[PDB]
Design a protein around this ligand. Structure first.
Ligand code: NAD
Ligand code: NAD
Ligand code: UDX
Ligand code: UDX
Lengths: 402, 402
């Protein structure tokens, strides 16, 4: 089968590689660097499995910037373009998904379009009315960055939407896509669910919102533990032995970050409009409150120091353990608040070459100097190469992961 | 060992039975009915395992109302009296725990006192200053009603507190109590944690608050599903296949009820005073909001009916599946709101003999008549004996449990 994938990020790339083993895949992007990298066997993102597959597997995969040439030839088109949350409109800016749908629909009259990009609840229905077709369905993605292909090889579950009154081709394609994902998985018993679009859209948003809920809770517990001078590890460990709570995804941080959790929680809150609820909105504010609290604790550790200048050394900007980006990294909001004061900020981030031209922070990638200059070292996740300056490191990290 | 247990409820009784297998237990209560029942081998509460143990196990257990005679002779005293949340003071009314501590301390100068009752964070420390002793420790209870002894035979974990500067007798007794609970368990690898009192107090409150959090979330998801006319089962099932969320404890209801979740969430919120947070308070308001929403949906189903009188038949008042009490039962708050209108309320509750003398609801325990008179049947958990009036039954129950 010839499949076109719109988007070369974590989602677009892992799906494209995943499906190129027994399908004829063409990935499309609007960045030449990414196309050239793919066509040469290189991943434009750090991913152990994607990297290994591009290099050692036999894949029928090619990249291009010629959208139309790719979409016209396709039997299925998977859209995995960006869907950022836009603060002005109070909603996801869906222009990058809409733009591809229009393009695909203008040069392809048979292909079903499968959206992998996280969208608002009610977007498929809305796109079907706007474009007057039923050839658009949603199949939520549950992958974690740094485990993008891994999570498609060993997925928790597979969900593809289609409506009761959809055409036989679209019902068949929805089923077919679901089974292409199932048979491509190396895991054996992957549950497959076919449900209505809005239901599938909701699943994605509610799943990520629950994960955000979890981090926020353990972060408010941690806020409480630090304020009452209690042993946070002892408390989290004690509540987590209840198998209904679990010992996973429960490591305190400066807040939930990354590309998805931040925006999806906001989207779900907007999709609620005026439906009754208090938790959904609290899940979003909790993150802000946790960030402010962290900044303030840092401010107090600082002022209690006798030094002509107060320097805060920020160790890493990565959004989670092992990450390769800083999207919505919680330490960035903390940094911002700190800047609202008179604190010199130095940042040690190997993965970064230069800070924005106007950034007041100073990038110091010589680790030795970094430690030398920092009065206090602030980091979201602790690292062993900080043992020699251990007593001036502030972090809420307990378990060394996530 | 001679152990005295203050309190004959779910907690006091299951611990007392649990420990009477190899210890000389004496349970104390201020209700003759409960003492007479225990001394004759009967459980004053529905509990399969407690019932079976009283009747078929060899137990060294006796009950009494003579507190002093029991506390003076004891080597350890376990306090499991009530700790209700008091709306006026905005806090747990700890008078029933305090009263036993004082009693025990006045006739016993060697016994360590172990509190199993859920208490405020900082209560042990507070009780130690008030009574000028260190002979008071906390060991949180994690049992579920209807599985009270079961949960002590197969506990998720065991936690007993003691402080670094406690006397050797109290450190030894804390350890000893922990091991009495471990060896009494039929489960093999039960994790044991010894931590500071405040840490242990927090574990209990944070654990129950998380469970309340979970129910509230799935209830707000359900509120959203009913309002947007979506398949709630399809959505919950889709998010629950993520092993990090899980397929457990996720069944929609009219709200979280029972004796513990309602009061513990309020207690934790009070223990936060002004420490920063938004989730903790939202977890409590969410329940109220969910209740109001449910009542309103019922009100709309009602008004859309042509009948001179509008009768709402409430099927059961039990607080959860298989429960034998109605403590903080969510359907009761729903009933209240309904009464705020002009709706005749009839209630079918076999376990109930008479409603309060002033209750405007009418108790109809003939199930046939109940169905005959009810315009709509409202129930927290559906039951098969309602199939013949299925189309007039309103419930958000999906999985038939919890
Ligand atoms: N990243 C995750 O962890 C994750 C997981 C599940 C779902 N999702 C969702 O999938 C979507 C994409 O996320 P991502 O992390 O892969 O993003 P990404 O930023 O890594 O990739 C987006 C890519 O789309 C390309 N692009 C933008 N417009 C295009 C267009 N009009 N035509 C073709 N290519 C275009 C960009 O060049 C970029 O390479 C988002 O909705 C995200 O919420 C993300
Ligand atoms: N019920 C649960 O699911 C559960 C689980 C874990 C912890 N807890 C906590 O344990 C405590 C007790 O809960 P419960 O459900 O067993 O309550 P319960 O109401 O079933 O039992 C309380 C008993 O204490 C007796 N009593 C009151 N004052 C007394 C006194 N001064 N001296 C002796 N006896 C007295 C009452 O007669 C009653 O029989 C509460 O703090 C509760 O929050 C309850
Ligand atoms: O215990 C934890 C877990 C997570 N977090 C934070 O929460 C944020 C998200 O962490 P995740 O590991 O979920 O990382 P990702 O954002 O890559 O994945 C997430 O979004 C995409 C979804 O498809 C994934 O299912 C979801 O896990 C990170 O900033 C992480 O540091 C904590 O602070 N503590
Ligand atoms: O999925 C669920 C689970 C629970 N609930 C509700 O939440 C309330 C609590 O349910 P539980 O099964 O936890 O019952 P219990 O109150 O007996 O146990 C709870 O309190 C005492 C603690 O020690 C236990 O660990 C805790 O589970 C009930 O009203 C129940 O109906 C739901 O509505 N949906």
């Amino acid at each position: 089968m010839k499949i076109a994938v719109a988007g070369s990020g974590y989602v677009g790339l892992s799906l494209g590689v995943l499906l190129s083993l027994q399908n004829e895949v063409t990935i499309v992007d609007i960045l030449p660097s990414k196309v050239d990298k793919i066509n040469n066997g290189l991943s434009p993102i750090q991913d152990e499995y994607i990297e290994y597959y591009l290099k050692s597997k036999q894949l029928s995969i090619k990249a291009t910037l010629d959208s139309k040439a790719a979409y016209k030839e396709a039997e299925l088109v998977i859209i995995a373009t960006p869907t950022n949350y836009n603060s002005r409109i109070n909603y996801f800016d869906t222009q990058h998904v809409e733009t591809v749908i229009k393009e695909v629909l203008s040069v392809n009259s048979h292909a079903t379009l499968i959206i992998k990009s996280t969208i608002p609840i009610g977007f498929i229905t809305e796109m079907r009315q706007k474009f007057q077709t039923d050839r658009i369905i949603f199949s939520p993605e549950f992958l974690r960055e740094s485990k993008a292909l891994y999570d498609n090889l060993y997925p928790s579950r597979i969900i593809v939407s289609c409506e009761e009154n959809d055409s036989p081709k679209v019902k068949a394609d929805a089923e077919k896509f679901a089974l292409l994902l199932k048979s491509a998985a190396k895991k054996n018993n992957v549950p497959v669910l076919i449900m209505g679009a809005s239901e599938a859209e909701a699943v994605k948003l509610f799943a990520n919102t629950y994960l955000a809920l979890r981090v926020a809770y353990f972060n408010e517990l941690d806020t409480y533990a630090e304020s009452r001078k209690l042993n946070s590890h002892m408390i989290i460990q004690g509540i987590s032995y209840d198998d209904r709570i679990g010992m996973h995804y429960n490591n305190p941080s400066f807040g939930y970050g990354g590309y998805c959790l931040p925006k999806d929680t906001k989207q779900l809150l907007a999709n609620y409009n005026n439906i009754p609820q208090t938790l959904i909105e609290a899940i979003v504010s909790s993150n802000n409150v946790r960030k402010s609290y962290i900044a303030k604790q840092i401010i107090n550790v600082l002022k209690e120091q006798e030094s002509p200048v107060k320097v805060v050394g920020v160790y890493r900007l990565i959004m989670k353990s092992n990450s390769d980006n800083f999207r919505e990294s919680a330490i960035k909001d903390v940094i911002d608040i700190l800047k609202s004061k008179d604190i010199k900020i130095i940042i040690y981030e190997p993965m970064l070459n230069k800070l924005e031209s106007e950034d007041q922070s100073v990038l110091v990638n010589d680790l030795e100097n970094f430690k030398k200059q920092a009065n206090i070292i602030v980091t979201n996740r602790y690292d062993n190469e900080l043992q020699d300056v251990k007593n001036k490191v502030y972090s809420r990290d307990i378990f060394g992961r996530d």
